Amino acid sequence: GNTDYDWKTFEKNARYEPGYNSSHPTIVMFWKAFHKLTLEEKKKFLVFLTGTDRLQMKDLNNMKITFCCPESWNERDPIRALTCFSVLFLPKYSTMETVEEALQEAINNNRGFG
């Protein structure tokens, strides 16, 4: 469902914590899920990661995400995010499926976010 939105620039310009890179297994498998989903689904992702809904192209083309896995991350930890500097809490999932499903979980509103 993509429609005139430069997503390459987004995955390319994103931030990682010191010692993490897009080449890390967990992060490449994360991007894989972000590329197969539709426009509606990725909008939900951004809407919970950022503090602005239905973000404009001017926002998206400079928008970044900061990947983070807490010192005590867990394989079953839910994917959360903070609107401070767009940090996405991504645990070190052992499989490519668990990250694909977790991507859906959070966009589908993982509940208890009150």
Curated annotation (Swiss-Prot):
Consequence of substituting C84A: Loss of activity; no effect on IRF3 interaction
Modification comment: ISGylated.
Self-association state and partner proteins as the record states: (Microbial infection) Interacts with human cytomegalovirus protein UL26; this interaction inhibits global protein ISGylation.
Places the protein is found: Cytoplasm, Perinuclear region; Cytoplasm
Function: Major E3 ligase for ISG15 conjugation. Acts as a positive regulator of innate antiviral response in cells induced by interferon. Functions as part of the ISGylation machinery that recognizes target proteins in a broad and relatively non-specific manner. Catalyzes ISGylation of IRF3 which results in sustained activation, it attenuates IRF3-PIN1 interaction, which antagonizes IRF3 ubiquitination and degradation, and boosts the antiviral response.
Tissue specificity note: Expressed in testis and to a lesser degree in brain, ovary and placenta. Found in most tissues at low levels.
Active site (record annotation): C84 (glycyl thioester intermediate)
Induction: By IFNB1/IFN-beta. In endothelial cells, by TNF, IL1B/interleukin-1B and by bacterial lipopolysaccharides (LPS), hardly induced in other cells of the vascular wall such as primary smooth muscle cells and fibroblasts. By viral infection.
Protein name (record): E3 ISG15--protein ligase HERC5
